[PDB]
Symmetry: D2
Subunit: 384 residues, 4 copies
């Protein structure tokens, strides 16, 4: 289960670089130089890294400090063969964004958040990123009167439309991926799920430029089925990026390593990505727990990739097993994939087998055989 | 707080008619004749009722039994002045639908579910309904291998497209409203939230024919903010119906009377519907607890309407209060409603006030004043 | 992974006998004769069955019907070698219990619930049960004014004290196990978690006669860590019974087969029961999904046992692995098991190494090595 | 609704002093001098303040710095008439406590956490505190192998027993209050609910010295009914302190002002505390949102008290209303308070009215009238 470049495993600088500050605790690790993280990730077999503007260039840097930070980072990339497939903006840490970036009630802040984004889009393109993620973690409210959501959606649409006009005007080959989250750090976050983000995108001026960046734990924070949401994003053609991690249920976002948290959901996720031929990076947005020293940071990162590869092997064995293929037919998964009424409306209307002569009790007596199928899946997952 | 016809309060037959069977208990009340429910609802000041096919006509009825059931119901409507604004299909109770209607793995069941729906669309139109709700409560799975979600979405789209072709072919003035729910009775339900349903609709052949029917408790079963989801549905132009009830958090769907459960969310909901000028029925999809006799059924139904009207009064007083209007300005709600960059992209790019000369620390020092605004809202809700 | 009598796997009659009625659906399977269930369970390698009074004897049976039902059941037990280690009362299905049994507001109902219980305690003893479970599924409320909880706890204590006096008066060797659940079918259930039940027991007149019967899914309905709660019950000496099943998070109680739901929690549960030498039955309180026919019922039941045995093997391999034993020492699990201050209070107070000369920064620099330990656990679970 | 000294409203220094750092954001407010907070709280009508050691004396202070900090604080208390009824230890912020204080796997850390606690117990007594809270926010785990919970409970018991021996040895009139929380900042926290804490206390050497400090939002993080848990703590005689705030469901702990979050639960809480004659401080453990400036901090704190007093008035009006008193009798709340079987076991056994001659169908036909009672409660809460 050793990673390869074709596995396309990628990590955010802020993942392994998380110093361990939480709502109730100070940092437990020193800050990492991005150069060190690139080298250590490469050694573990990662293919690339990602960044927020502020992870790579300290907020408020002069042009000369900006250039030096980028130069050093690029040297580490060149030294290792690491790629930068995705970048994003920090529109959440600085106090100025306490009510939002794109949907701050203050218009001056909205305009600033756009200009900060556009600056980093240019950098992302310089570094070869083809995806630009937007996580509006400050967009939302703790109280009902604070945020008129229709007006906030109008501002959010205006912001993303301006970004689309910008990339089009520059001739860039970069696309956007909107990352939903239901809550945390705001009491409620706007576009709280994959579904709300997909629906929003369809209202944009240039919807082809935007997809989703779903994150395992984010959908699980609302108790939703992550594989199901990924399926709807694939069905819509909008899975432009994915963030992989673990989460134990409906609680604060834990950002556990991938494979931890809901292991069976991880299995069905990998099965779906691999069956569908998803071609994007397998990006980990996780935090090594603050209990760990740097050895444990690198162990946790390695574990992300390892668990993906173990699950990949088990899912492939499941799908290739003739006994599972038989059980899939026994449960009529083949029939689910066939059109209900390719004969057309009128033919359906005229078909007595669909109504007057449909034997409902005979149909109801048929078992689905789902339990035997699921125990085959369990046996395969556990290597039993 | 006495209801009027213009309040347009409506109830499902299955609400006040719920006999009290639950996962662990037998019925505690006798079945109600729909005629009795129409009369009792009218006496309380309801404006209309709604129905599933099977609530009005016992499943498996002959044509003559069907006609008699409808005739009696229509007499009660005529006797009372009650309307029937919405109808829906039962595609969940009968064992034949144990794996779904429109997305059953068995194709024969899918075709039958369409024919059952189309039959009741014709009835709905005969009774003057302008909305047809679809709640796919059996669409989904308990296990991962049981349901390929992309194939199920293809079947779901095919079904709704056929229904759209049917209504168009008949020249009917009826539109569809898809009701999301995240889980229960399936482990996970397809289209689990307002967002997923909105996104799905945009993929239909005739998207103008479909909206959402959000239900208070359903979105709260995923821990989501119901007012926020209603706002996104209004923003999209897709709020075709609403189902009102109460829910205490993330648990089994409780179907409490409206106002019970999350009272502050109920307040912000009413504020939003009334401010936005929502024109549809205020429909209650609730269950009087099985602890109650029929006196308690009618009390619970009356309480639905009463709580809506109390909340309406308090929300209107909030919005009309000059002190609240001042607090809204103090929190910059007026600025949220103004375009970020009506000057355009290039002007924003050229505006040093948005970047080089934006004083981030001065902007960050500004309080939002959200707590004072929310305590005004609390004072108004409580009549303090 | 084939079950043996020493595995002591047991099943409730109402598990495999669940006909499939849910909040939104009719039965999908015919009722099973208890005799058939005993025979089929035995064939799968179960060691015993359990029952509610009403599962074995139809409610309202004459004395002669009661005797015949028991006679047939006993013949099936004798024919198979199956045991009956536990019994319980149905104080939830009949409408009379809609506000509770032991804590019904009506005193007449409370007295009846005690008499119904005592009758079945005598039967349980006749059948050789050594544990008597009490699940107060109707004890609680949907609204705040309905149930004064201090008065209800007084009634609950009075009821359990009377049962204790009864068993003591008869000289029976049976003990009670109180089964917590947080909600469903009441909005909130009294004694909602293992902790609340443990605390309650300590207030009883004869606390040695009562323990807990924790159920996997019940604690997971409150988002709690089931292994942790089992650990506290073991620490208290109060784990008198356990109910095994699966649950996917905070939602309606799903009663999935054991191993489904939170698989990693299942692994840590089995590890804990086996490490602690738990000696009671491994009882499954689950429902084969209503999608299944009887073949799927028996498959689901077999899967319960299979998953327990796979997990047992993997947990034992984890604990026996010298690399894991080393990692446990590296994470200081050995030190957690050593007294903080066996030297005593005054010695601790006088120990400068505990205060003035404790190097907090050196201590804080030490990693816990928990991630490497957990990835060993993951590798073992998956057989990697 | 203006606060008075007899209202006994108290606040933690860390509440109004929270600078606004969260998992994704820097501070938005400057640090407050404790002196300023005492004066501002007093002006709003608070009666007292509380503290962690580290809120009053910067961690690592010399003896002279410690004395000066305490002297200034005491002057502010004397200047205002503010009391200090409760104190507590910070055993969570410093990296040394990343795996716990009392249950850290490292024994040296456990001993240090005891010595840090004991130092501040002496200070608490000097300042006149009669309650000493313990919130073990770092006690727990993210992974299953990291923490043997039985061993951790042994260490937790050892620690609390040593603290009990210490206070007894000094002749102090201070008692302990253990504050449960289910998760955050650990993945799972030990003693996660009121129930688990109550049960734990009964195992201590001197259980009379310990009670619980339940917090509204903490129990609501597990989806539990806070009023119900407070009722069980009162029933046990163990409500030694309470922490008041708001929470919107099962999510990260929000620490909203009291009255926000679940307003109806707040109403039933106040009703219960006032009806039971709870005599302790009404302590607010909340955080003014980081959106606010200092004006909003003081507004949020004022709102805590205001909402308590509005709710107190409405609950008292509910209980005094003859119509509610009649509805309580109609729902048999009076009968819930009467013993089930003061006649004794044998009399119950011999009572045919409890069994052979109990008319179950007549009893089941009786409505509980809970909906009318709850709508009276709603009407009273809203002043309708
Ligand atoms: Mg992410
Ligand atoms: Mg509905
Ligand atoms: Mg059970
Ligand atoms: Mg607290």
């Amino acid at each position: 289960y050793q990673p390869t470049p074709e596995d396309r495993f990628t990590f955010g600088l802020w993942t392994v670089g998380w110093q361990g500050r939480d709502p109730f605790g100070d940092a437990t690790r020193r800050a990492l130089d991005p150069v060190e993280s690139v080298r250590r990730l490469a050694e573990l077999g990662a293919h690339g890294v990602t960044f927020h503007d502020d992870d790579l260039i300290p907020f408020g840097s002069s042009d000369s400090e900006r250039e030096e930070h980028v130069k050093r980072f690029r040297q580490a990339l060149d030294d290792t063969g690491m790629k930068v497939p995705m970048a994003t903006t920090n529109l959440f840490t600085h106090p100025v964004f306490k009510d939002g970036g794109f949907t701050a009630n203050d218009r001056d802040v909205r305009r600033y958040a756009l200009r900060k984004t556009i600056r980093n889009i240019d950098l992302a393109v310089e570094l070869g990123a083809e995806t630009y993620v937007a996580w509006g973690g400050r967009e939302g409210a703790e109280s009902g009167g604070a945020k008129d959501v229709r007006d906030a959606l109008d501002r959010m649409k205006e912001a993303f439309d301006l970004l689309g006009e910008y990339v089009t005007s520059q001739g860039y080959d970069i696309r956007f991926a909107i990352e939903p989250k239901p809550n945390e750090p705001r009491g409620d976050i706007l576009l709280p799920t994959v579904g709300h983000a997909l629906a929003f995108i369809e209202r944009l001026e240039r919807p082809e430029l935007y997809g989703v960046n779903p994150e395992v734990g984010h959908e699980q924070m609302a108790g939703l089925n992550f594989p199901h949401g990924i399926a709807q994003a694939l069905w819509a053609g909008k899975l432009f990026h994915i963030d992989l991690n673990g989460q134990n249920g409906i609680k604060y976002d834990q950002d556990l390593r991938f494979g931890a948290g809901d292991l069976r959901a991880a299995f069905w996720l990998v099965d779906l990505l691999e069956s569908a031929g998803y071609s994007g990076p397998r990006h980990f947005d996780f935090k090594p727990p603050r209990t760990e020293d740097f050895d444990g940071v690198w162990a946790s990162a390695a574990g992300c990739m390892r668990n993906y590869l173990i699950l990949k092997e088990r899912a492939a064995a499941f799908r290739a097993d003739p006994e599972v293929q038989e059980a899939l037919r026994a449960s009529r998964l083949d029939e689910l994939a066939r059109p209900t009424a390719a004969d057309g409306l009128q033919a359906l209307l005229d078909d007595r087998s669909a109504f007057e002569e449909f034997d409902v009790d005979a149909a109801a007596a048929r078992g689905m055989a789902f339990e035997r199928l699921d125990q085959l899946a369990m046996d395969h997952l556990l290597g039993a």
